[PDB]
Amino acid sequence: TVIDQILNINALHTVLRSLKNSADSLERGLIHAFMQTLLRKSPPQFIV
Amino acid sequence: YISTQVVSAPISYGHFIMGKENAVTAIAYRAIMADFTQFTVNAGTEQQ
């Protein structure tokens, strides 16, 4: 049916676009974890 | 008063398949117009 084709292609887009969102999230988490470790490592300027 | 005669009978089920129009209205408006296309194309003419 036409409605079943609508829901099929919408569920497929939901899965694909959530996968894209998850890959973007892993990249931004790489950004954030690396910035987290730089701030854990960096001593302040008056000490340096 | 009882006879037996040959009558032109149906043998298969009828169809009703939606169009894209009906799928669109079913999702947006929670409803179906039946004969939506005949209904549509007799709008501005005299034979409403």
UniProtKB/Swiss-Prot annotation, chain B:
Where does the protein end up? Virion; Host nucleus
Q: How does it assemble?
A: Homomultimer. Makes the hexons and eleven out of twelve pentons. Interacts with triplex proteins 1/TRX1 and 2/TRX2; adjacent capsomers are linked together in groups of three by triplexes, heterotrimeric complexes composed of one molecule of TRX1 and two molecules of TRX2. Interacts with scaffold protein; this interaction allows efficient MCP transport to the host nucleus. Interacts with capsid vertex component 2/CVC2. Interacts with the small capsomere-interacting protein/SCP.
Could you tell me what this protein does?
A: Self-assembles to form an icosahedral capsid with a T=16 symmetry, about 200 nm in diameter, and consisting of 150 hexons and 12 pentons (total of 162 capsomers). Hexons form the edges and faces of the capsid and are each composed of six MCP molecules. In contrast, one penton is found at each of the 12 vertices. Eleven of the pentons are MCP pentamers, while the last vertex is occupied by the portal complex.
Family as reported in the entry's similarity comment: Belongs to the herpesviridae major capsid protein family.
UniProt protein name: Major capsid protein
